[PDB]
Design a protein around this nucleic acid. Structure first.
Lengths: 96, 346, 153, 224, 153, 344, 115
RNA sequence: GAAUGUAGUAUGCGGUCCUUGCGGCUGAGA
């Protein structure tokens, strides 16, 4: 779904997947919270020479509001979620 | 690298659910299908997994007859391995390794993966005859020129493997074309005084040609004999319908069984919250054929009764002809049983 | 005109309709639960019986005479019971997706080209009905996912 | 819906009259509703004024306008009791302490709702069908005819004035004659006391309310 | 191209229900009686058979049996609303079972040469069972469309 | 799959094997095979009632294993003393199934991945369909397709049991009847005429004594000398074999159609759309389903259930001449069958 | 093994983006898992998904041939024209297996050398 | 510059729970 996902239904889709694949409701809610918080900070490599977006991500700021002002936020959020799942896959393989 | 090929007819006696977990769909649990055509299919990895499991059980229980003689894997292990044979059988007794004939035919266990490979290459089970309900008669066995062309192309594989000539001559006269509003069906389905047959919810004008069904019928006799999985083949020739490729595709997509399973809360006595899921099943009396290609046994130090592929072939034919397997998993609810009838071509 | 853009349109449309239903009928959870169950049940009805059969079945739960088959003229707020409201909303969403997609501006503008899907089933060939069946199943899958995500019962 | 414009519950195999268990459960539930309404009419109306107002509004919408007619009578009491037992079963916990006298023993409202079950809990009592004992099936007839003679039918249907015209057209319906013996059985699933309470309540229901058609004309009444 | 029989069923049911709605829009009683008769007909067919139902339709019409040609019935020539509804139902059922949705349509009709009542009169039980299935299906479609778009009572 | 037990279901009351996945003219249909239409009871539904009934017998300590009472609390304690109280609390809170049920049917949904169940409940197929007749009030009707499917069932148990002697009991059956012909006992044939009337049809009678006698013997071997309350010889003359499509028409039409209403006390009549139709399997119908038993895969099994044979006798001794509820409408006295546990 | 005319009616040339998207997503992704006979269920962590090229995929590869090194070769393989005829004849209408799933019937491809 | 093998999307899960085929009708008119 990372290819075809947008910021509006990000939370709803993640919540559905969590409640579907978790054990109880509290674990699903915790997974939703940690995914929502963590996936904000992920660097992206757009086609254009864009470093301002990475600069906004590097601190934690109005970038979320700036993303709304940004003209290609859908690609940014898609790359963010895909990278977060890739890194969590790396971590899962490392522990397992 | 492959010398002999043996076909594997499959006739479902219970609904078959080959699970396909690589599907991004939550409506139901679908059966795996050929993505580029939609036809139902059973992957060789699934088919080989139930063949190897059944074959290993028979060898462990000492039920396989080799060259019309009983097979003792324990005694044969000493003849084959001599030294360290007692160590090897401990792994099998610990369920870490498989018996000798199982490892020779299908391959060694996961631990001994790099030791060698198997002797057989279990093909993919593809559709040959689909059961759809009909207005006249209980139901009909349906196929299409695309399936027939696939079957004829499969005999070319066997003919080239064995360097045979008559194998490709079996269906060389098969040139059947069908318009979307035409069909070729037996006399047990044709509506009286109309030359029409109603499969599912489609009215199809009956074409006037009897050679196509006749030559098709005897082809199954070549691979399966006269005994059509427990019934005379002439008794079912009257209920075989040939439909166009598109019409057959609609039957494969939508006429498969869909069952709404559920779980109930014991205390409340009603359906538990969120406990409702639906599955899709292949209909019973569905005829599918595989194609097992077997080469020389890679592993050396082997008994004379399993010397060549021809020796290996007779082991598979004897132990699998007219045998019931459980392909796919819904065993606890009695789903997946299928009659198996092997047999080499002419 | 690839697969992923179609999936994007499906997700956006399903989220839009489910959010509209959640916001408009937030107070009454009965209609929300009925809509969720009806959505999760709908695609299987389509598979077992057909798109036309389930479309007619939806149209028969309106408790009010209909002048002519048309999804635009529907108004689910008129009906009183939660069952009829849920059936009307589900039928409206299905028909509007099959007739307009996510609007003319979006990449996917539907299949029936503005006609009522019931009429399309009525006078079109079997191949077109099958294609509309697959589209309805996909959009209903997305609607079920979003309804399970948001709607509460 | 039969070709004869009338029918009768006849067994598909042996062609004998029988009372389906669904009818027994329904008549028992409705007799319990009537007893509850008669015994505690205004009390539950005070407790549940909101749902009774909702029901009055629903009747008003369906029946012309009748904005505030809403006669707070036994009919409305039974209607709101049924609405409680069908869609608001959770609210019955407050009235579970109440008890209604049936026959000789008393039965709680919670006991009744456990007996008949709700949309979220299965009933605790099994209601079997009723069949006539075959011993009497040879001596006395188990089936007989009855007459419907609707004079003034145009007056009832087309609105014509009554009087000595509109020659009646009679049609007949089959029915089991009086005195035919029947066997009833109810089985519990959790507590046998629930089974015996359901048996007593059903006995009273068949004694007073009656089952089947024309229950408002004395039809379908039983006695010990 | 091929057309599924369900499409012809839906088209015929919609055509007949829209025709009765348009012709007798003022007649609320006719529409209500026709809806009730359409919803009650399948049960009668199941209980007493298709031929008994067809004859019972003619019993209320006061027309005699053995002169039953559906083409020779003017359903509007009956004064009573009940007679009008019964004539409409019988004509629709017989037309479906004799000609389907037309010769050019996918469903050309089962009997195809005479009135279905005569078909049941002098033909084997397998054919009458096929006709019973066809009648039940078309009756379900007609009942759905009537309950949807026709005024009840 | 070591041993297979055949379960015979005989409907005392109409059975509504719910489907809930389709809509028809007569609403609320029953589950049937799609390509044939014959009424079947899927294994998942049939297994659920068996598992549920088994739980009550164990939880009430009513299961007789090896003619001895099964105290599951001590049996679980002896087997699993490490977590005897921990497991008991799981089943006390209904989060887990008791010890015996998990061994036989399989672990509860909580412990899905622990192991697999030892029982493979097959689907229940139609065997005898009661159809009304002029003389011989109702005739048990069977079709060549049914016995052919029954023959394959006997082949399956023969392969499972490695007993060829049971694979030739019904092998001598091969009949090709037209639609207008039938093979029926004398009780159904009209006196003075070689014709029979089965609720809508006049069928000429085809004469062959062995076909019915072969089938009669098969049921006698399968379910003993008591046919659920009557001698088999008393019903041998009522059995009729009809053509394939004739049997299909009977099952699609002769099933019970019951009209049910909801009466609102406000008015006293049927509520607005408070009437619906429910389809039921007719009373006195016979359905069979094999119960395959494999090796119990639980670790540290008790010596009384260690092997498949000890499982089979427990299943037979607890599910023979018993009454179960199949499908919905439990509280209105519907779906009750008398079960017979038979071994070939 | 199929008539050429039956193929001419089934070519569907699409755009590059459409064609590129199809090859990424229209291939068969097959879920696979290993079952342990001790419990009958699946083993923890023994689940993965593998992707397969669809059947009926006409591939083509250019084979470059040159004159072999002179090391007293036989008289039949002197020049390039002789060394290509052997390769073409011995491989036309062959049936070899590619990939690492031979034992499960994956890899068999029919080859047609360009004469 | 040249120079794979081994692998069953399976394990556990009851389309169930709540619903009176009811409502109204002179075997009578002389």
């Amino acid at each position: 779904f990372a290819d075809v996902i947008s910021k509006e239904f990000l939370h709803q889709l993640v919540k559905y997947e969590a409640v579907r694949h978790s054990i109880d409701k509290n674990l699903a809610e915790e997974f939703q919270s940690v995914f929502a918080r963590g996936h904000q900070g992920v660097r992206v490599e757009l086609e254009g020479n864009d470093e301002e977006i990475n600069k906004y991500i590097s601190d934690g700021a109005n970038l979320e509001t700036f993303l709304d002002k940004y003209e290609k936020a859908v690609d940014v959020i898609r790359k963010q979620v895909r990278g977060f799942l890739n890194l969590v896959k790396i971590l899962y393989e490392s522990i397992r | 690298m492959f010398e002999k090929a043996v076909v594997f007819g499959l006739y479902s006696i219970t609904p078959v659910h080959a699970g396909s977990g690589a599907e991004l769909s939550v409506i139901a649990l679908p059966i795996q299908r050929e993505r580029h055509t939609g036809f139902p299919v059973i992957w060789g990895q699934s088919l080989k997994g139930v063949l190897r499991s059944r074959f290993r059980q028979l060898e462990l229980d000492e039920k396989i007859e080799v060259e019309s003689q009983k097979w003792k894997w324990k005694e044969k292990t000493k003849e084959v391995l001599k030294e360290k044979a007692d160590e090897f059988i401990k792994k099998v007794e610990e369920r870490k390794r498989d018996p000798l004939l199982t490892e020779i035919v299908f391959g060694p266990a996961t631990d001994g993966a790099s030791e060698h490979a198997g002797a057989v290459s279990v093909g993919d089970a593809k559709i040959l005859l689909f059961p759809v309900r009909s207005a006249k008669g209980v139901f009909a066995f349906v196929t299409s020129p695309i399936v027939i062309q696939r079957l004829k192309e499969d005999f070319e594989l066997v003919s080239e493997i064995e360097n045979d000539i008559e194998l490709k001559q079996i269906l060389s006269r098969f040139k059947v074309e069908l318009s979307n509003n035409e069909t070729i069906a037996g006399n047990a389905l044709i509506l009286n005084g109309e030359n029409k047959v109603i499969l599912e919810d489609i009215v199809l004008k009956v074409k006037s040609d009897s050679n196509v069904i006749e030559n098709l019928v005897e082809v199954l006799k070549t691979l399966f004999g006269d005994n059509f999985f427990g019934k005379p083949i002439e008794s079912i020739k009257e209920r075989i319908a040939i439909v166009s490729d598109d019409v057959f595709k609609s039957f494969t997509r939508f006429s498969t069984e869909i069952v709404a399973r559920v779980r109930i809360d014991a205390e409340k006595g009603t359906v538990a919250r969120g406990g409702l899921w639906y599955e899709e099943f292949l209909p019973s009396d569905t005829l599918m054929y595989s194609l097992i290609a077997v080469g020389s046994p890679k592993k050396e130090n082997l008994p004379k009764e399993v010397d060549n592929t021809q020796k290996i072939v007779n082991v598979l034919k004897v132990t699998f002809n007219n045998a019931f397997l459980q392909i796919g998993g819904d065993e606890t609810v009695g789903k997946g049983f299928v009659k198996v009838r092997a047999g080499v071509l002419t | 005109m690839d697969i992923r853009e179609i999936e994007q349109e499906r997700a956006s449309f399903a989220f839009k309709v489910v959010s509209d239903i959640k916001d408009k009928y937030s107070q009454n959870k009965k209609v929300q639960g009925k809509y969720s169950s009806y959505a999760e049940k709908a695609p299987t009805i389509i598979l077992n019986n057909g798109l036309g059969a389930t479309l007619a079945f939806f149209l028969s739960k309106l408790e009010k005479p209909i002048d002519d088959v048309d999804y635009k003229s529907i108004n689910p707020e008129s009906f009183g019971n939660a069952e009829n409201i849920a059936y009307a909303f589900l039928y409206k969403h299905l028909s509007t997706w099959l007739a307009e997609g996510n609007g003319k501006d979006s990449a996917f503008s539907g299949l029936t080209n503005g006609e009522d899907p019931l009429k399309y089933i009525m006078e079109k060939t079997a191949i077109d009905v099958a294609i509309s069946t697959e589209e309805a199943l996909s959009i209903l899958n997305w609607i079920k996912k979003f309804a399970k995500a948001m709607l509460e019962e | 819906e039969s070709v004869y414009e009338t029918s009768i519950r006849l067994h598909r195999n042996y062609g004998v009259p029988y009372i389906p268990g669904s009818a027994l459960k329904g008549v028992a539930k409705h007799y319990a509703f009537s007893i509850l309404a008669r015994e505690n009419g205004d009390e539950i109306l005070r407790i549940y004024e909101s749902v009774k107002e909702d029901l009055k509004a629903r009747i008003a919408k369906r029946d012309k306008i009748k904005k505030n007619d809403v006669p707070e009578d036994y009919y409305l009491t039974a209607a709101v009791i049924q609405e409680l037992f069908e869609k608001k079963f959770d609210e019955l916990g407050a009235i579970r302490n109440t008890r209604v006298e049936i026959g000789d023993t008393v039965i709680s409202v919670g006991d009744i709702v456990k007996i008949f079950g709700t949309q979220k809990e299965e009933g605790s009592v099994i209601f079997f069908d009723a069949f006539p004992t075959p011993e009497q099936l040879k001596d006395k007839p188990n089936l007989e005819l009855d007459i419907m003679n609707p004079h003034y039918q145009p007056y009832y249907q087309h609105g014509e004035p009554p009087g000595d015209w509109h020659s009646p057209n009679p049609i007949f319906f089959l029915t089991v004659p009086a005195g035919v013996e029947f066997t009833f059985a109810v089985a519990s699933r959790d507590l046998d006391d629930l089974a015996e309470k359901a048996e007593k309540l059903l006995k009273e229901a068949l004694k007073k309310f009656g089952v089947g058609a024309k229950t408002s004309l004395g039809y379908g009444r039983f006695d010990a």
